[PDB]
């Protein structure tokens, strides 16, 4: 269902993040030819700090991947479904605070856009965890979207009926009359 | 959808061929080739995949 869909996409996005990050050696930064031919690492390769700090982040998203695969394959019938409320906090709180830092990473003067193989999973998982918390707060029953689409369709049906009867061809003309 | 409901007298659901004819022709050949670009530009970056 809906929460099941979110948890499934979380496990598969984190699986992809790992299977892509480690199974390849390392990325190479943009060269930016002509960038101060001296020092300050402009027009250079990468280094121990970067590589290992990143190899970490991959392990963090693995941890939350395993937490989410556990929750999915366990409470897919959503043992007892409720006291998982413990784990729920551990899956939401962290998430939002993570997002916080990311939401200010542009102000921090960081380049988050050149390398997709690292920041993508982090941003996507933060968003997924936050929307999961939101949907668990109000319990989208995976059938309430059906009621939403039916409401908008009923409105647009009421609109086209008025349009047709006012501007195209009256309903009293096109339909048959009885009794004679 | 509205005009078919008014003409045929019953709302088309996935159990009836009207729904599937509308789906295929209308949606898949008129609304999909641009909603696809909209989603591939604005909603996949909201996930991890590039």
């Amino acid at each position: 269902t809906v929460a099941g869909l979110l948890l499934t996409t979380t496990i598969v996005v984190s699986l992809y993040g790992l299977f892509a990050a480690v199974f390849a050696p390392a990325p190479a930064l943009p060269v930016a030819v002509g960038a101060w031919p001296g020092t300050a690492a402009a027009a250079a390769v990468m280094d121990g700090s970067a590589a290992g700090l990143r190899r970490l982040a991959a392990g963090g998203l693995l941890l939350t991947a395993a937490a989410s695969h556990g929750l999915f394959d366990f409470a897919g019938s959503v043992p007892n479904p409720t006291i998982y409320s413990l784990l729920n906090l551990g899956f939401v709180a962290a998430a939002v605070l993570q997002s916080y830092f990311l939401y200010i990473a542009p102000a921090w003067g960081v380049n988050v856009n050149w390398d997709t193989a690292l920041w993508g999973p982090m941003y996507g998982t933060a968003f997924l965890g936050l929307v999961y918390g939101l949907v668990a707060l109000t319990k989208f029953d995976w059938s309430s979207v059906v009621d939403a689409v039916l409401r908008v369709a009923c409105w647009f049906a009421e609109l086209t009926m008025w349009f047709w009867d006012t501007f195209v061809w009256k309903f009293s003309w096109s339909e048959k009359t009885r009794r004679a | 959808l509205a005009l078919l409901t008014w003409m045929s007298g019953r709302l088309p659901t996935p159990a009836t061929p009207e729904f599937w004819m509308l789906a295929y022709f209308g949606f898949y050949r008129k609304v999909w080739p641009d909603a696809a670009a909209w989603l591939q530009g604005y909603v996949v970056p909201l996930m991890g995949f590039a």
């Binding site: 059906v146 409401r151 049906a157 | 709302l11």
Partner: peptide, 18 residues
Amino acid sequence: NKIKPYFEAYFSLNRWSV
């Protein structure tokens, strides 16, 4: 309001042919 009932039924014949 000729078409609302067909949607409320969810989010709640030419006798000469046979």
